[PDB]
């Protein structure tokens, strides 16, 4: 979750 | 080849692979961390024309490729493409076998631990390295300074750090991470170039805009008077010849691009800025650390070769820090490479050779060994 | 005439002028944004035969004219021809004096600012409007929805938008712009009609192909099974009588034309598609915005009257968005006009009458006033 | 005969059959793509006098025949007459059996796919070739150059191309097609010869005018000063002895004939010209392709043996392209044959022998196999 890249 | 067991220092931040050997001045291989791939059909029969172009060759052919960065905000997103990047790193550029050399990888703090863990699994399972070690990138950026006390800002292509260290001891509660870095500045510059009249939308045109950002941008010590300075006359305009023809002429975009780094509201990102995350990392440290962080404020990765960012940096941290403090922004012109250079120092230390995560200890403890030996 | 000072709402996207008054249901004047011009000599003496035909008259005479759109991808290229278009707009079609009425122009986000600035200079200097205001076109497309929260796709003749708005606040970092729209679909349809056997190359024949696209195209909810459905039998073939004689019969070209909108590789354009630029505009917004963008996904300009594009749109955004999210594609059948209709709402608001860029403020601050009063 | 299974390279553009074997310098058979037919009655009894004359024999008897080209603008119109042309090609001129040889046909881009499909059906069903392959004609014109990067103009008798290719990859969205070529120039020359005083109206007289165009025409680097040069003195007049007697003397018609190629308004055809369709094909390519298209602008089919058309070509593309670009018009004097020569290269490649559309794959997948194996 988050990001793009993060989950 | 290499007649010894010299350690490899591979440093992919998020946008530029810089790899080489330990005990070495500069990285031997510096190339873009891209993997390109043809987006329309091959017509000349008998050509070669492999269906993957990694590294500098991809920028040689970027007019017919869709360029794709396998590592975004310091997090590896494509794992098979990062294996293309590592395979090209060891076997084509650095031109060596990974089975013979311990390797030193780098990543950022506050990263997903599956990045570090899968990076260890790919180093031992796929490339069969004898030893391996992940390293916090700003820490190594302080190894290149020759200092054991200082707070480190580096700001690579996907992440910026502010790791404070005092007398050899890091302060991991006072650590920082902002996901605003040079690829975000490239995208914002590409947006305001669309504001002036020049439309860049392709990944290859994104690489052109990144080149405009590198050649032709500075940081504007006082942003309001520089802004009105560009609004007054055309003495700040500067032309850039695009590949294959048309020239462009940029004005206030020359310094509005890294002002986003000092003011992240431009890219719509709720943060405090670079200058306030340094000061907040210092204020999270103890009271008896802070003047030794003020006088040792190392500013040493990529996206810091904007002219005047140490002047803006000292000029703004001085406004935050109390008076009668000595604010020294260390900006050593060998940065963009000093994370690698401190990797070369750390891997060439003699105390360090029992800190490698070795195989038969990877095989004993699985891939989670990195969370007891690395940090 | 008009016994009041009602504001003009002129809306030239890139391919169709729709103009009228504020406080009004539909635009009073809808005509093609073309200027035609004779390409061979006049022989009947005593004829009139003016050497410029603007608007609908140009399509009445397009067999002897070279039609030319003065506005391409939302950017005005010919300025004297756009002045022909505006002159015909106010004085012939809408049949009114611009000196008596504030005017509301529209353009796209991420446009060159000399388009907006020269449009303001032409409105005050040439037509002598008392007040003037440029407006972001998808924002107005949300004014017609009666919503203050939603992400707006419109896709006119030269540009598509995806402007996200939450609780009245736009997210200009999460804004989008793709230069794939209906004139590009007209050109691609003209190419694949050349693949079937029908050669259309003239600008008038381009206008015929545009008519074939409007009458006789849908979007194909599942493109592969629709493609094999057309390959199996001739139940998808449909005939179109060309002007002056010969009939044509089109098959898979009926739905390969707007699949380019969902898959821009067909026209050789490196992009993500309409459905992924919506999802990427939503993911660029904050975490607490997204379900209110999922349930309010307004799809409201031209080139969206393809049958089933809301079904393809929901069917593909649902595949991108997480489950337990409510994807509502708002496709209000009054679109192709809702940018004008929301222009009529905004210009008829009472809070808005101090947001007009007025003359004596244009004369005070030059033509750059648009970058402090408009947005 | 032929003791091997050498591939046939048959190349009918629209007006001249040039056929031969693969792995060969020049085409073995070059003859006009006409089929003649007697238009009045046979009176000498015991004569032979077959009621169809194909190829060069038709120009030997064109005074008593109505000559008819079975292929118009690169599209085969008469199929039985094209079967006469192919039958004469294999069995009379090239004097070989098609059952023993794979054949390489050529056509233009953006053609009706029933041309390609029916050409495959006639090659397998009628002539029983073992393998067959249609090929894009300008692509093969780049195979003869020894280049894998360049934009190709060829301009045969019925069609002109501009296919751009970069590093072996064609850019099919940037492809072009104009239906202005040498038969149209022959008709326009025949019209302006009627303007001077010489009436040519028969198909045989059309063949005489085509001969006048080949012998006695150049392209006029600067058309206005060449036009006034012919208007000043008679130093540009040149005489041509017609068959059987009367001599003619042509002036400005010597260079007004291929100026139609650079300026299609003369034949009443709404287009941009040859020099602007090249530049528009280059500008449709990506930014990082264009200087490698500027320096590799191959100009290699028929109707390019006008003297000075490379000088006019470079002189006009330089005026369109930006400065500090290197415009190299490649005009290799073996053109008019280089589509065949590149056909000979491609059919003699060893990588290519699994790209033939073979029989038992034609029989398996019908005649639509050409749209998955050819391009
Ligand atoms: N001279 C320069 N001026 C401004 N920015 C630069 C310069 N050189 C590199 N950059 C930017 O720095 C980033 C790369 O920094 P670096 O730390 O080497 O990246 P990585 O994170 O891959 O190690 C790129 O985004 C590049 O655009
Ligand atoms: N019923 C329809 N189906 C498909 N496309 C349409 C239809 N009506 C209009 N279009 C296309 O929409 C475009 C015009 O939409 P509009 O939003 O009015 O354009 P503008 O950008 O000029 O406002 C034209 O390209 C036209 O071909
Ligand atoms: N020396 C020449 N100068 C000018 N035009 C020529 C010359 N030779 C041939 N042509 C023209 O070129 C055309 C044939 O070109 P080519 O490409 O060989 O035809 P095809 O398209 O049938 O292959 C004919 O129209 C002929 O008039
Ligand atoms: Mg780095
Ligand atoms: Mg619109
Ligand atoms: Mg030819």
Swiss-Prot record, chains B, C, D:
A biological process term (GO) from this entry: skeletal muscle thin filament assembly
Positions bearing ADP-ribosylarginine: 177
Entry PTM: Oxidation of Met-44 and Met-47 by MICALs (MICAL1, MICAL2 or MICAL3) to form methionine sulfoxide promotes actin filament depolymerization. MICAL1 and MICAL2 produce the (R)-S-oxide form. The (R)-S-oxide form is reverted by MSRB1 and MSRB2, which promotes actin repolymerization.
Keywords, in A-Z order: Acetylation, ADP-ribosylation, ATP-binding, Cytoplasm, Cytoskeleton, Hydrolase, Methylation, Muscle protein, Nucleotide-binding, Oxidation
N6-methyllysine modified-residue sites: 84
Molecular-function annotations in GO: actin monomer binding; ATP binding; calcium ion binding; calcium-dependent protein binding; cytoskeletal motor activator activity; hydrolase activity; identical protein binding; magnesium ion binding
Modified residues annotated as Methionine (R)-sulfoxide in this record: 44, 47
Residues with PTM N6-malonyllysine: 61
Location of N-acetylaspartate modifications: 1
Residues in the signal sequence: none
Subcellular location, record wording: Cytoplasm, Cytoskeleton
Catalytic reaction annotation: ATP + H2O = ADP + phosphate + H(+)
Miscellaneous comment as given in the Swiss-Prot or TrEMBL entry: In vertebrates 3 main groups of actin isoforms, alpha, beta and gamma have been identified. The alpha actins are found in muscle tissues and are a major constituent of the contractile apparatus. The beta and gamma actins coexist in most cell types as components of the cytoskeleton and as mediators of internal cell motility.
Assembly description: Polymerization of globular actin (G-actin) leads to a structural filament (F-actin) in the form of a two-stranded helix. Each actin can bind to 4 others. Interacts with alpha-actinin. Identified in a complex composed of ACTA1, COBL, GSN and TMSB4X. Interacts with TTID. Interacts (via its C-terminus) with USP25.
Name of protein: Actin, alpha skeletal muscle
